[PDB]
Amino acid sequence: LGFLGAAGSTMGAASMTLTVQARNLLSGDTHWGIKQLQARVLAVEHYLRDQQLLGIWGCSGKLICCTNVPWNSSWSNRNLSEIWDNMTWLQWDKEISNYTQIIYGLLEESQNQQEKNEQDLLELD
Amino acid sequence: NLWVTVYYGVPVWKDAETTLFCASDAKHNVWATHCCVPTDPNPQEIHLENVTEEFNMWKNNMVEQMHTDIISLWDQSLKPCVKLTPLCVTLQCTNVTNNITDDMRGELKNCSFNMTTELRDKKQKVYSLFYRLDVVQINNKEYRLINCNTSAITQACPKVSFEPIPIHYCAPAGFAILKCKDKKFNGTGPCTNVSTVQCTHGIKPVVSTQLLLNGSLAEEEVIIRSENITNNAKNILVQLNESVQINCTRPNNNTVKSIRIGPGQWFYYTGDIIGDIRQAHCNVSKATWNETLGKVVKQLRKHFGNNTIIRFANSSGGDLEVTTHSFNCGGEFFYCNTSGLFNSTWISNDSITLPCRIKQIINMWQRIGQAMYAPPIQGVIRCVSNITGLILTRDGGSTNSTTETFRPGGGDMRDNWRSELYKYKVVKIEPLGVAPTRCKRRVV
Amino acid sequence: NLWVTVYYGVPVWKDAETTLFCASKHNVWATHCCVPTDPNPQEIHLENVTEEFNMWKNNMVEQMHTDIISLWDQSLKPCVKLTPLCVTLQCTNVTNNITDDMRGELKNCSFNMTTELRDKKQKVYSLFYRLDVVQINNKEYRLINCNTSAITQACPKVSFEPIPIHYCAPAGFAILKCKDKKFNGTGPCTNVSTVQCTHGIKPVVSTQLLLNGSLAEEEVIIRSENITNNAKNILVQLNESVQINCTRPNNNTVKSIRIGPGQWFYYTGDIIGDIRQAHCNVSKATWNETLGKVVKQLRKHFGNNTIIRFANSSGGDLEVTTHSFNCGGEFFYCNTSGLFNSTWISNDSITLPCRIKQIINMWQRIGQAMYAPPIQGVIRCVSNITGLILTRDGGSTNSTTETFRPGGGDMRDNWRSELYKYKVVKIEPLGVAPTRCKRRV
Amino acid sequence: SLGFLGAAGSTMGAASMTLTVQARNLLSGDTHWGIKQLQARVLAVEHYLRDQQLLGIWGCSGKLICCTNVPWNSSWSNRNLSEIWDNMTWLQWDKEISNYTQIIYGLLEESQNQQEKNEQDLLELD
Amino acid sequence: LGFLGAAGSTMGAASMTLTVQARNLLSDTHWGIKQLQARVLAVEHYLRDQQLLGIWGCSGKLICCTNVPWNSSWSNRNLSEIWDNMTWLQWDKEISNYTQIIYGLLEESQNQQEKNEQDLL
Amino acid sequence: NLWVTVYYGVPVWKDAETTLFCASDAKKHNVWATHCCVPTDPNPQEIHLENVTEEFNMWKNNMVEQMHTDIISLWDQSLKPCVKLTPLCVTLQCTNVTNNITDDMRGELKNCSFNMTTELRDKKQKVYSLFYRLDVVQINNKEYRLINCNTSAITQACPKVSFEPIPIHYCAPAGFAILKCKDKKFNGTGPCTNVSTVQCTHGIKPVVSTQLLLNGSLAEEEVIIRSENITNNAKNILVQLNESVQINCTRPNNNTVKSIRIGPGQWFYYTGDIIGDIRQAHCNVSKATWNETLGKVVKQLRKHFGNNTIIRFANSSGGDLEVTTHSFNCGGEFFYCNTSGLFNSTWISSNDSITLPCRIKQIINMWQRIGQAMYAPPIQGVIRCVSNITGLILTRDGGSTNSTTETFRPGGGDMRDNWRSELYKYKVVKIEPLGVAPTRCKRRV
Ligand SMILES: *[C@@H]1O[C@H](CO)[C@@H](O[C@@H]2O[C@H](CO)[C@@H](O[C@@H]3O[C@H](CO[C@H]4O[C@H](CO)[C@@H](O)[C@H](O)[C@@H]4O)[C@@H](O)[C@H](O[C@H]4O[C@H](CO)[C@@H](O)[C@H](O)[C@@H]4O)[C@@H]3O)[C@H](O)[C@H]2NC(C)=O)[C@H](O)[C@H]1NC(C)=O
Ligand SMILES: *[C@@H]1O[C@H](CO)[C@@H](O[C@@H]2O[C@H](CO)[C@@H](O[C@@H]3O[C@H](CO[C@H]4O[C@H](CO)[C@@H](O)[C@H](O)[C@@H]4O)[C@@H](O)[C@H](O[C@H]4O[C@H](CO)[C@@H](O)[C@H](O)[C@@H]4O)[C@@H]3O)[C@H](O)[C@H]2NC(C)=O)[C@H](O)[C@H]1NC(C)=O
Ligand SMILES: *[C@@H]1O[C@H](CO)[C@@H](O[C@@H]2O[C@H](CO)[C@@H](O)[C@H](O)[C@H]2NC(C)=O)[C@H](O)[C@H]1NC(C)=O
Ligand SMILES: *[C@@H]1O[C@H](CO)[C@@H](O)[C@H](O)[C@H]1NC(C)=O
Ligand SMILES: *[C@@H]1O[C@H](CO)[C@@H](O)[C@H](O)[C@H]1NC(C)=O
Ligand SMILES: *[C@@H]1O[C@H](CO)[C@@H](O)[C@H](O)[C@H]1NC(C)=O
Ligand SMILES: *[C@@H]1O[C@H](CO)[C@@H](O)[C@H](O)[C@H]1NC(C)=O
Ligand SMILES: *[C@@H]1O[C@H](CO)[C@@H](O)[C@H](O)[C@H]1NC(C)=O
Ligand SMILES: *[C@@H]1O[C@H](CO)[C@@H](O)[C@H](O)[C@H]1NC(C)=O
Ligand SMILES: *[C@@H]1O[C@H](CO)[C@@H](O)[C@H](O)[C@H]1NC(C)=O
Ligand SMILES: *[C@@H]1O[C@H](CO)[C@@H](O)[C@H](O)[C@H]1NC(C)=O
Ligand SMILES: *[C@@H]1O[C@H](CO)[C@@H](O)[C@H](O)[C@H]1NC(C)=O
Ligand SMILES: *[C@@H]1O[C@H](CO)[C@@H](O)[C@H](O)[C@H]1NC(C)=O
Ligand SMILES: *[C@@H]1O[C@H](CO)[C@@H](O)[C@H](O)[C@H]1NC(C)=O
Ligand SMILES: *[C@@H]1O[C@H](CO)[C@@H](O)[C@H](O)[C@H]1NC(C)=O
Ligand SMILES: *[C@@H]1O[C@H](CO)[C@@H](O)[C@H](O)[C@H]1NC(C)=O
Ligand SMILES: *[C@@H]1O[C@H](CO)[C@@H](O)[C@H](O)[C@H]1NC(C)=O
């Protein structure tokens, strides 16, 4: 399908559309010219912020990444079978509201530790 | 077995506000000049399977942008044009008396004044006819133009066409336009048939005050949409599922003359008139009108009770711009009397002829401080247009008589675009998210 | 033995220039600085950091100058022009209810102005101050700027009252603060911290003496780019404020006319009651103690065996020789010679007369004249002196007696006071260092 | 954690654990005024991208800390390693050298070129 | 040697300058806008190239080997001609507008590889 | 047994339009320099490309189009803050200047008077001045108005602003490169084998003139004649000379310039009087040089027309002064010089400098646009300028009956042609870093 045809997709099914969603993110009177110029700049800023975060978390090389952060019961209490193919991703997303900063902080810290540990030992005399 | 996985490129979005740009493709038309992007929307439609969305037309920021953008284009288009400041002089006038019917007695005045010309040193005496609506007595009598005590007036440039053409609004990267596909949607429902486009439908900016012209029709039934049905002080936007054809003319054959005032600045004169003097008129089929209103009433009573009697009275007192049906017909500005359309009470072929007046000074968008002068148009004017909807208000002040009254409404023009784009929403794309996987990062 | 290793995100910076944005109802400042500031200062004190500051080279001063000029020019852009009024005036003196501290100061003028219709003229009467009117030669007069510049009426609905202004760094930049007690404006500073934005600095415009600014804290602090060089101004920051109560005592009437379609002109009309000169009241006791404190601090720069005298101002135009400020929206010019008479050898207030002027050539710029519409009623304000601009009279022959004269200068020096503590730097995330490891291959 | 540049007083070694905060604060989050603001945003982006491009070129993309295959030259600096990492901050370090920037970058560019061409030959062989 | 210097060199030889080119791709209201528009476009083109290398799994390498088989239909020219005699300009003329075909194929190979790894982890 | 190999930083490009930025050197109030505040590099680069071929087409070149667009804009922006002369167009009363003038230049000037508004709105002042007849049109007793009064507002150019052309370098934005053809003898309408890449163009002065190309690039080997279509007689022929010819032009009379205030800081300048001799403006070009130069051009034309042809020169078609004469700016004044003295002879199968008269006018419809006008303040003192002719613009009459005799005449057209000549050797391309090729490697899985 095309962009967003995955809207009704389950979390499992949705994994096969990560490339259509990703490829469509980039690009397609004084006051008019400025407004459109501003819009283009903002699109770039949003793009870069997302890339920076994936970089920081160590998942910049993939559309799908396993992290070194455990899942918390304070975030959700559902089964793997409940979530995959028995859940539509759009709803899964509303269900994780307010957990964004918690999760990001954890991703940053676990990545900080992994890089540090590798520097101390794999690079060791 | 409890871990975190992260994804990029997930099909997720949030309600969002961004700036849209226009595009249109089909001479010196302002809309055509401005909306320079080619469109050609061949791949636009993507259906979203298993999607329900919340829409709310009354909070549509796109309406606000159209209002803003339309005014901006209008003003910009009039900047490189002739200023008529030099015409704020004492004007001497007498009555036009020749070949005038009763309906037009005193309507036109024969005026003259001392105008400047190319050299500062030279003056010229000129003559013109005016509609009484544009001229005020000073107090053989002396007059001034109505705008001179408030602001300078600018003459619109004759080559420039403001004729509305379909305009498509296109999203910037990172955004999408989401559309409701529900024939019974009243503007705020949780639509269960949703699709998206990158650029929307070509909707033309037709501007009017009592009834709505050249819009879309409802697919199956008349739909009555209001932000608060209960609130009497709201415009009710009624969309018809059938159009009503209306024919409207300006029967007098106008001679247009022009005089140079400045180095390249020219002013257009009304000249004189060929043919007996008559007022302007619009014609609506009586039977069609009666069927149309009855259809509205049935739906209206579904909201207000099917044992209710509904009176459709004419407009309330107020300024011409408020009480009449105002529209642009062939470049001319008409102010028509709609009382002839609202004289029935609903309980359990000839046309309707509506007299109309013409005014050349327009305080468009009700923004006081500026005025535009509409040059006279050579010959006669005829246009045909479709009534695709209307605006009503409740009169209120009920006595629990179960007899509601709905006079015609009015207001700014935001409601006009809200009606046409009631089905569209804008969202932002959000590519990142996580899930409760059982996979841990595999590390040394 | 050692290898090159590189890092990203290294906490270092370089001196740099950039554009700071402004952040905080018909007030020009409020309108422009529509962006709110965060409620949280977010200041990080740095440990083990010394930084070098130089207030005389702080480019933030230049930015503020540019920004203020822009706002004034923008603000007057949509206002009615008064060029239709550059006509010959017929004037006589106002002689009734005169105390003679203003004899001939105000004149009664009349003129034929254009009304909204071009073919109708009207006789109008008004009262003008001598400062705005010159003789052409019941004599023929003209406004002072009708031979040099266009005159624009400031819009009656727009306030220019200064509000605190905060400047904020763009991403990639940071602002460092000095905050070193008794710092003289230059060199290494050890009380350094990092901030996102400056505090709110109110852009009060004045000459000779600075009003409603920051204090010197514990001691009076005197700063100059060069102590010896008499070409430099001396910025004296007081450690306590001095209040001054200033008024325009006459009860005025405001009248207006249409000079065009939607074009209204405002004028002084009539005066209710009798005539009194504008004036400012300064406590002498406070003032005399204040000056002594200033001298005690000046002594560390010139020697404690030197005798000091304070002189009145030098010659120049009104904007140069008198103290100037905006009070109630009116423009006051005050004679401060009475404040600088004494010598220091090793309620009892003073009243300073003031003058009122309506046509203002702002910022020492010529070609853009602003007309100040009249204010009805009586004007009163109380302002705080927080510092002075002084110069050393110069001409010294090493006589051991020195004289300091009130100075003044470009508005940049006033902003230089509150911008004293701030510096902006660019962040440089990359760096290289030696280590033990070689890249794994 | 002190936050952005709170590491200014930290030793070079200690400061390595704050590289992430410094990275986070590099991205953001009247006709003339509008232009000035656009210029500011564009330049910030250009600087960000230039640093990322170079990390790519030098083969350290995705890392905050990267070992290279370029040996250290004592002509740039000849100091005790323990003094560098434990008794100096990064700001002091930068000031200590404030040189040889182009030399180092040239060495990094080439050592990456050597590594990628060697990988290409080996992979075509197997 | 220099920016786009060895333009006439063969495709194989040309590998020696690919880095110089990469390093040189990054840096009155009407005038100011023209310049901003130019800067923005340069950024957009740059990011699109990076995005493509990302989606194909080549973002970490200047020179990338992929698993997409070569189609003799696109070109039946020999490696002995392509790397040793032809230049990149000539080659591009002979790519005969099949670039987008290859892009679609590269994208599919990458999708398969990322999914397979995730199932294996 | 092949797969796809992906490369980044690939040395390929495409023809592409983009704008260039303007740069200038370190050498006031010069309009060009004021706009082009970006300095050029002290050390320019050029890389010759070995085993390179390219194609140039000067007739389809957006570099020229940009230069035109920007030069117009700059001109107009420069006049934005200058005093408008709107109040100046009042009934003008004139008599002819005949008492001090020789029969030559007699009748060129009129002595006119008018009542103009001064600093105060209540007053007018009586002003009289000298005018060229070309700026004044009769109304009908003697009664005149300014010639462009009934077309547009006239703005006085600001007297401090210099328009003297300075070399301008156009520089590529990142992602783009400028290619140039170094072939010693080519017409730039096709393939080139000596090609190099540069960051910026050679500086080109923004000289404005018609039917004659002044202070440009000189050909090095021979006269080179180029056109878009040789057989199309409706097109201009650009002739690039390989030897320059010096032309000495003057405005010989010593005037007096006066000025008045017409408003609050508004100054108007006009010619007050003339002291001494009154003579027509003129230009002097060596005859011998001209005949040899023209002969070289003819030899070059013969290469395209035949061994037995007859090459006739004649003057241009009649029409507006602006298209008919060799217009140019000399010392800041606008000259409209005769052409016929140089185009009379037919070529068959001290130095007697030719003197041509020049007209001068102060109201100019700049850039051949209608609806705008500028007034040239009078310039105080005697004016002399000496310049180099580096090229010519001619048309062929066509309508051939194969008589073998053909006529060439001076002619003009859009001023872009002047810049096409200077830019005939440059092209702009977009750099395209990605590409693919077949390989013997596959990824490890
Ligand atoms: C609802 O929708 C309808 C249908 O589109 C609109 O009706 C149209 O209104 C426009 C504007 O008045 C009409 O266009 C004008 O037609 C004039 C007459 O043209 C005749 O001859 C041509 C052939 O040459 C026929 O195609 C045409 O049907 C007529 O028989 C022209 O003279 C007008 O020209 C104007 O502009 C030119 C420059 O472009 C000037 O030189 C002219 O002097 C003049 O100013 C113009 O083209 C159009 O014909 C109507 N369509 C139909 C089917 O009748 C309604 O107006 C719209 N309602 C609302 C409220 O918007
Ligand atoms: C092709 O190229 C030639 C270059 O030689 C051009 O001819 C030159 O034109 C310029 C512009 O008018 C001349 O420069 C002017 O010269 C005037 C004469 O003064 C002479 O003596 C002084 C003594 O120091 C010299 O510096 C000066 O160069 C002259 O030799 C000056 O009075 C002018 O200054 C005034 O005008 C300028 C305008 O920019 C102002 O900036 C100044 O403040 C001042 O008001 C000016 O310097 C130059 O002299 C000419 N060269 C020759 C032959 O002498 C041709 O014009 C050009 N072709 C075309 C198409 O024009
Ligand atoms: C342009 O073509 C010439 C050949 O005409 C190239 O010369 C080669 O030089 C290398 C050494 O650097 C030799 O090993 C080759 O054998 C030469 N080629 C031939 C056919 O003899 C020259 O390198 C080419 N220039 C560029 C930039 O590629
Ligand atoms: C919507 O639901 C149907 C089952 O009724 C399913 O086959 C289809 O794939 C779903 N749509 C999407 C985008 O997954
Ligand atoms: C989950 O979050 C709570 C806070 O609500 C915290 O106390 C707990 O330690 C967290 N557990 C894990 C496994 O992260
Ligand atoms: C986030 O917190 C709010 C608090 O009111 C809650 O309503 C909402 O459901 C939460 N979102 C989640 C847990 O997805
Ligand atoms: C608006 O809607 C509410 C709920 O239906 C109703 O109570 C209210 O009366 C409405 N507005 C007014 C002013 O009637
Ligand atoms: C409605 O009709 C009445 C009947 O005379 C009239 O007075 C009134 O003005 C009409 N509408 C308006 C504008 O009030
Ligand atoms: C008016 O006032 C001036 C003060 O400048 C004085 O010189 C003059 O004599 C006065 N004239 C009259 C009428 O007394
Ligand atoms: C107004 O104009 C008349 C013209 O007769 C003149 O006498 C009178 O003095 C003028 N009045 C003023 C105040 O200038
Ligand atoms: C200030 O400048 C003068 C010269 O103008 C010099 O003699 C003196 O030493 C300078 N003093 C300082 C504080 O640098
Ligand atoms: C002078 O002052 C008295 C007292 O307020 C007042 O009654 C009188 O009218 C004033 N005279 C004039 C000319 O204003
Ligand atoms: C960098 O090298 C230059 C070469 O002379 C030197 O002047 C400069 O001081 C060096 N940088 C520092 C500050 O160490
Ligand atoms: C491919 O063609 C070239 C040139 O004709 C030839 O040298 C080569 O042997 C052919 N096949 C291969 C790859 O050997
Ligand atoms: C010019 O004007 C004078 C008036 O003195 C007249 O004698 C002469 O003939 C006129 N010349 C022409 C050709 O207009
Ligand atoms: C233009 O060139 C073509 C050859 O490409 C030629 O056939 C044609 O006749 C030329 N046009 C004219 C008017 O000679
Ligand atoms: C005659 O024509 C030939 C080409 O056929 C040319 O090479 C030769 O130079 C010409 N000779 C003359 C005298 O024009």
CA distance C391 to C320: 13
For the record, the structure tokens of A56 come out as 């920081």
Q: Pocket of ligand 4, candidates A3, A9, A16: which has the most ligand atoms within 8 Å of its Cβ, to mutate? A: A9
Other beta carbons less than 10 A from residue D34's beta carbon: 18
Residues 6+ positions from F432 with CB-CB distance below 8 Å: F10, F12, F13, F14
Query: Chain C partners of A125 at a C-beta cutoff of 8 Å?
Result: 436
How many residues belong to chain C? 441
Is the CB of residue A49 less than 8 Å from the CB of residue A77? no
List the subunits that have 3+ CB pairs under 8 angstroms with C: A, B, D, F
Q: Which residue among E58, E67, E88 places its CB closest to the CB of F11?
A: E88
Interface contact flag, D35 A31, Cβ < 8 Å: no
C124 membership: H or E segment, kind and range = strand C121-129
CA distance B257 to chain F (A): 18
Q: List the end-to-end C-alpha distance of chain B, in Å, as a whole number.
A: 19
Enumerate chain C positions whose Cβ falls within 8 A of a Cβ in F.
Answer: 83-84, 86-88, 142, 145-151, 367
Angle at C10 (CA atoms; ends C6, C11), nearest 5 degrees: 160
Residues 6+ apart with CB under 8 A from F232: none
Ligand nearest to the CA of B303: 7
Owner of token pair 């400098």 = F353
CB-based contact B381:B329 (threshold 8 Å): yes
- Strand (E) positions, chain D? 65-71
Return the partners of chain A (3 or more C-beta pairs < 8 Å).
Answer: B, C, D, E
First CA to last CA across chain D, in angstroms? 48
Most ligand 10 atoms within 8 A of CB, residue of C112, C140, C142 to mutate: C112
Considering only alpha carbons, which residue of chain B is nearest residue C115? B149
Q: How close is the nearest chain E Cα to the Cα of A28, in Å? A: 10
| Ligand at shortest distance from the CA of B375 | 1
Question: Distance between CA C49 and CA C47 in Å, rounded?
Answer: 6
What phi and psi, each to the nearest 5 degrees, are found at residue F156?
-80, 130
DSSP notation for D6-17: GGGGS-TTGGGG
Distance CA B63, CA C401 (A): 76
Burial class (CB in 10 A: 0-12, 13-18, 19+), E80: exposed
| Nearest partner of E59 among E2, E110, E93, judged by Cα | E110
Task: Specify which residues B127 forms β-bridges with.
Answer: B112
Cα separation, F339 vs F290, in Å, equals: 13
Phi/psi at D107 (5° precision):
-65, -40
Record: contact A65-B5, CB cut-off 8 A: yes
Q: Amino acid letter at C93?
A: N
Q: Provide the token pair at A118.
A: 């590798």
Q: Is the CB of residue C356 less than 8 Å from the CB of residue C331?
A: yes
CA atoms within 13 A on the CB side of C25: 5
Please state, in angstroms and rounded to a whole number, the distance separating the CA atoms of residues B422 and B426. 12
To test the pocket of ligand 13, the residue of D79, D91, D95, D99 to mutate (highest count of ligand atoms within 8 Å of its CB) is: D99
* 8 Å CB contact between C18 and C426: yes
Q: Which atom of ligand 2 is closest in space to residue F29's alpha carbon?
A: 41
| Strands B379-392 and B332-336, sheet pairing | unpaired
CA torsion D16-D17-D21-D24 (nearest 10°) is 70
B187-193: long-range contacts, CB 8 A cutoff, minimum separation 24: B187/B55, B187/B56, B187/B57, B187/B58, B187/B225, B187/B422, B188/B55, B188/B56, B188/B57, B188/B58, B189/B55, B190/B52, B190/B53, B190/B54, B190/B55, B191/B52, B191/B53, B191/B55, B192/B51, B192/B52
CA torsion through residues F136, F139, F144, F148, sign: negative
For the CA atoms of F112, F117, F123, F128, the dihedral, rounded to the nearest 10 degrees, stands at -20
Rounded CA separation B200/E49 (Å): 29
Cβ–Cβ < 8 Å for C4, D104: yes
- Kindly determine whether residue C3 and residue D30, on different chains, have CB atoms separated by under 8 Å: no
User: Is any ligand 4 atom within 6 A of the Cβ of residue A111?
Assistant: no
Asked whether at least 3 C-beta pairs link D and F within 8 Å, the reply is yes
What are the boundaries of each domain within chain D? 6-125
How does DSSP classify residue A6? Answer: G
Burial of B102 (0-12, 13-18, 19+ CB in 10 A): exposed
Minimal-distance CA residue to ligand 14 atom 5? E81
Three-state secondary-structure class, residue B248 = strand
Interface contact E62-D120, CB threshold 8 A: no
Mutate to test the pocket of ligand 6, among A96, A98, A99 (most ligand atoms within 8 A of CB): A98
- In angstroms, this model's resolution equals 4.2
Buried b (16+ CB within 10 A) or exposed e, C366-404: eebbbbbbbbeeebebebbbbbbbbbbeeeeeeeeebbb
**Residue B402: what residue type?**
T
Q: Do chains A and F touch (3 or more CB pairs under 8 A)?
A: no
Chain A residues with CB-CB distance to E115 below 8 A: 15-16, 64
**Residue E76 buriedness (CB in 10 A; 0-12 / 13-18 / 19+):** exposed
Q: Which tokens go with B55?
A: 């829409």
Q: Count of CB atoms within 10 A of residue F191's CB?
A: 12
Contact residues, chain E, for D109 at CB < 8 Å? 19, 23
d(CA B213, CA B295): 18
Which residues share a beta bridge with C197?
Answer: C168
Q: For an interface test with E, give the residue of D35, D60, D121, D124 to mutate (most E CBs within 10 A).
A: D35
Asked if the Cβ–Cβ distance from B119 to F149 is below 8 Å, we say: yes
Cα–Cα distances in Å, from B288 out to B223, B341, B387? 18, 11, 11
Output the six-digit token pair for C6: 């590189």
The Cα–Cα gap between F275 and B206 comes to 69
Give one word for D5, left, alpha or beta, with left for phi > 0 and alpha for psi -120 to 50.
left
| Buried-state track B332-354, b at ≥16 Cβ within 10 A, e below 16 | bbbbbbbebbbeeebeeeebbeb
CATH superfamily, domain F1-82+163-206+423-445, is Human immunodeficiency virus 1, Gp160, envelope glycoprotein (2.170.40.20)
3-class DSSP state for residue B128? strand
Q: DSSP string of C302-339?
A: H-TT-EEEE----SS-HHHHSEEEEETTEEEEE--GGG
Is the Cβ–Cβ distance between F215 and F334 less than 8 Å? no
Contacts of E26 in chain F (CB under 8 A): 174
Measured CA to CA, the distance from residue B307 to residue B310 in angstroms comes to 10
Min Cα–Cα distance to chain B from F79, Å: 18
Chain C residues with CB-CB distance to B369 below 8 A: 262
**Ligand 17 center to F309 CA (angstroms):** 12
Cα separation, F161 vs F158, in Å, equals 6
Contacts for C146 with CB less than 8 Å, ≥ 6 apart: C86, F119, F120, F264
Residue contact E21–F439, C-beta within 8 A: no
Contact A19 E47 (CB under 8 A): no
Residues near F258 by beta carbon (within 8 Å), at least 6 away in sequence: F129, F269, F270, F271, F272
In eight-state DSSP terms, residue C437 is -
Q: Which of B134, B188, B162 is nearest to B358 (CA)?
A: B134
- φ, ψ (nearest 5 deg) of residue F130: -95, 140
Q: How was this structure determined?
A: cryo-EM
Structure tokens at A67: 């992290």
- Whether residues E51 and A19 touch (CB distance < 8 A) is answered with no
Kindly give the distance from the C-alpha atom of residue B313 to the centroid of ligand 8, in angstroms, as a whole number.
9
d(CA C42, CA B275): 80
Of E111, E115, E120, the C-alpha closest to E54 is E111
CA distance F380 to F331: 10
Between helix D101-125 and helix D31-57 the angle, nearest 10°, is: 60
CATH hierarchy code of domain B1-78+152-205+414-444: 2.170.40.20
The values of phi and psi at residue F37, to 5°, are -75, -15
F160 DSSP assignment: T
Query: Which residues in chain E have Cβ-Cβ distances shorter than 8 Å to A23?
Result: 51, 55
CA distances from B122 to A21, F95, F155, F213 (A): 71, 21, 22, 45
Report how far residue C380's alpha carbon sits from residue E53's, in angstroms, rounded to the nearest whole number: 70
User: d(Cα F7, Cα F53) in Å, to the nearest integer?
Assistant: 23
**What distance in Å separates the CA atoms of residue F370 and residue B264, rounded to the nearest whole number?**
11
Q: Scanning the structure block, which residue is given the tokens 């009129």?
A: F110
Note whether F111 and F95 are within 8 A (CB): yes
- Beta carbons within 8 Å of C399's beta carbon, 6+ residues apart: none
Bridge partners (DSSP) listed for residue F6? E64, F436
